[PDB]
Amino acid sequence: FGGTDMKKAIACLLFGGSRKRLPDGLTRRGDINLLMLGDPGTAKSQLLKFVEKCSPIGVYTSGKGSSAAGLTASVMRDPSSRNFIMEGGAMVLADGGVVCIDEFDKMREDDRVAIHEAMEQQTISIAKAGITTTLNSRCSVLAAANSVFGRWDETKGEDNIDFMPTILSRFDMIFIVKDEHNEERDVMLAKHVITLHVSAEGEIDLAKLKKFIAYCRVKCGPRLSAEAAEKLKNRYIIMRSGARQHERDSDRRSSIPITVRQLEAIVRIAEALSKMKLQPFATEADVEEALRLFQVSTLDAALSG
């Protein structure tokens, strides 16, 4: 039920932006990163499960890896055969895919390093006694979590999250899901759940949707039209100025910054929107929708304080 903005963000995440490499050799990732902080009642885990099931290549794990399956990749030389066995975690297993990381706030320090260096550069760099490799992890990170206190209390705004600016920068979009006060919403949710259970058209089945996503990703790589890029530049300038103003007014550094990573996140969302239609160029409508979704994400960067 509900969560329409989150569902649109999930579709954008599934279709992804456009991976780019410039002449100098550098790379710009085309995979969106989504975070879903919210109360435990909501269906964040269910959304992650569906995303894993529907993605062409998708692995659903936890912050502390999984049972007998790690989160990132390690390499160990077998002393007898001397071969370097590469133990692959979720990130390397879902290369060119999606990693649905539930309980994102409960990771180890090594996992934190690996995710920091893999959410943006899409690579895991390992250097054991023998070799110095750089594994490839092209994966969109769909992370779930909960408030540090278990439930979000507005009285402690900007303190319900324990994540660092360095890790929140890596995220393209961040959503906050509350469940506080709506009797109408509660009755509708109960009706919908009881419906679902008893029942167990404009809806693309899972198989065709997965094939559609794969086809779009393989075929189309969009870009930005000049007018759309100019509009995005203006909106980004005003948004950064507003963030600066809010931070200076609150006299506290908001723990969810707006940065060039956010600019590129809007770019990637627009590219994904265009890719849905297979338009080799992104239009002002697509950039406006991307900005609207990033605004729904920004309803915690500025409004929360």
Partner 1 sequence: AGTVVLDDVELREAQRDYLDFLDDEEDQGIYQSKVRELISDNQYRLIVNVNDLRRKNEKRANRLLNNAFEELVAFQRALKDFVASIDATYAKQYEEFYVGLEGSFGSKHVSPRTLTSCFLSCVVCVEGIVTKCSLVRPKVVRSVHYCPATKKTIERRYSDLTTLVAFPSSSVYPTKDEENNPLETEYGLSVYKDHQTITIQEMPEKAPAGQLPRSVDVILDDDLVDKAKPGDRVQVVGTYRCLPGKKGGYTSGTFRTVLIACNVKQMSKDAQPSAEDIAKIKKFSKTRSKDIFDQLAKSLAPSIHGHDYVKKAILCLLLGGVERDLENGSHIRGDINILLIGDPSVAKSQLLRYVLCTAPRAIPTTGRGSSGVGLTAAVTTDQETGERRLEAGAMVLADRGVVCIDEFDKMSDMDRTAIHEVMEQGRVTIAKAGIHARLNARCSVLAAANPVYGRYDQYKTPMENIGLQDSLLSRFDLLFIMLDQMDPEQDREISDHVLRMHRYRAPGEQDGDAMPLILATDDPNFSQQIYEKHDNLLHGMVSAAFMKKYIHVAKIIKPVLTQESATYIAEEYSRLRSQDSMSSDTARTSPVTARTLETLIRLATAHAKARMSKTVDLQDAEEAVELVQYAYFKKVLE
Ligand X SMILES: Nc1ncnc2c1ncn2[C@@H]1O[C@H](COP(=O)(O)OP(=O)(O)O)[C@@H](O)[C@H]1O
- The answer to the question of residue 190 lying near ligand X (CB under 6 A) is no
Pick 187 or 278: Cβ nearer partner 1: 278
Of 174, 181, 142, 182, whose CA–CA distance to 304 is shortest? 174
Q: Closest by alpha carbon to 58, among 139, 135, 116, 113?
A: 139
| Number of residues near ligand X (by CB under 6 A) | 18
Annotation-wise, does 108 bind a ligand? no
The region of 3-11, 48-56, 186-194, 227-235 touching partner 1 under the rule CB under 8 A is: 227-235
- The binding track of 71-110 with respect to partner 1, each residue x by CB under 8 A or -, is --x-x-x-xxxxxxxx-x---xx-xx------------xx
Select the residue interacting with partner 1 from 1, 3, 8, 20 (CB under 8 A).
20
By the rule CB under 6 A, 260 interacts with ligand X: yes
Name the binder of 92 from Mg ion, partner 1, ligand X, none, CB < 5-8 A by kind.
partner 1
Asked if residue 178 binds ligand X (CB under 6 A), the reply is: no
- Asked if 114 interacts with partner 1 (CB under 8 A), we say yes
The helix/strand/coil state of 26 is coil
Note whether 247 and 253 are within 8 A (CB). Answer: yes
The answer to whether 131 and 75 are in contact (CB under 8 A) is yes
Query: Which pair of tokens denotes residue 241?
Result: 């100025």
Q: How near is the Cβ of 59 to partner 1 at its closest, in Å?
A: 11
If one asks whether residue 120 binds ligand X (CB under 6 A), the answer comes out as yes
218 binds, among partner 1, Mg ion, ligand X, none (CB under 5 to 8 A by kind): partner 1
- Pick the closest to residue 82 from 125, 114, 48, 130 (CA basis): 130
Determine which residue in the list 13, 135, 139, 145 makes contact with partner 1, applying CB under 8 A. 135
Amino acid occupying residue 113: V
Q: What is the smallest separation between the CB atom of 44 and ligand X, expressed in angstroms?
A: 3
Residues 6+ apart with CB under 8 A from 240: 258
Strand 84-87 versus strand 132-136 pairing type: unpaired
Contact 65, 90 (CB under 8 A): yes
Binding partner of 43, given ligand X, Mg ion, partner 1, none, CB within 5-8 angstroms per partner class: ligand X
Distances in Å between the Cα of 82 and the Cα atoms of 77, 114, 126, 176 are 6, 25, 17, 48
28 scored as a contact of ligand X (CB under 6 A):
yes
Binding site for Mg ion (CB under 5 A): 45
Sign of CA dihedral 53, 55, 60, 65: positive
264 touches ligand X (CB under 6 A): yes
Q: Which two tokens stand for residue 78?
A: 């077998």
Decide: 60 and 48 in contact? Cβ < 8 Å. yes
Binding string, residues 182-221; x marks residues near partner 1 by CB under 8 A: -----------------------------------xxxxx
Residue 156 or 192: the one with the smaller Cβ distance to ligand X is 192
Alpha-carbon span 145 to 159, nearest angstrom:
14
- Provide the binding-site residues for ligand X, judged by CB under 6 A: 1-2, 28, 40, 42-46, 120-121, 144, 189, 192-193, 260-261, 264
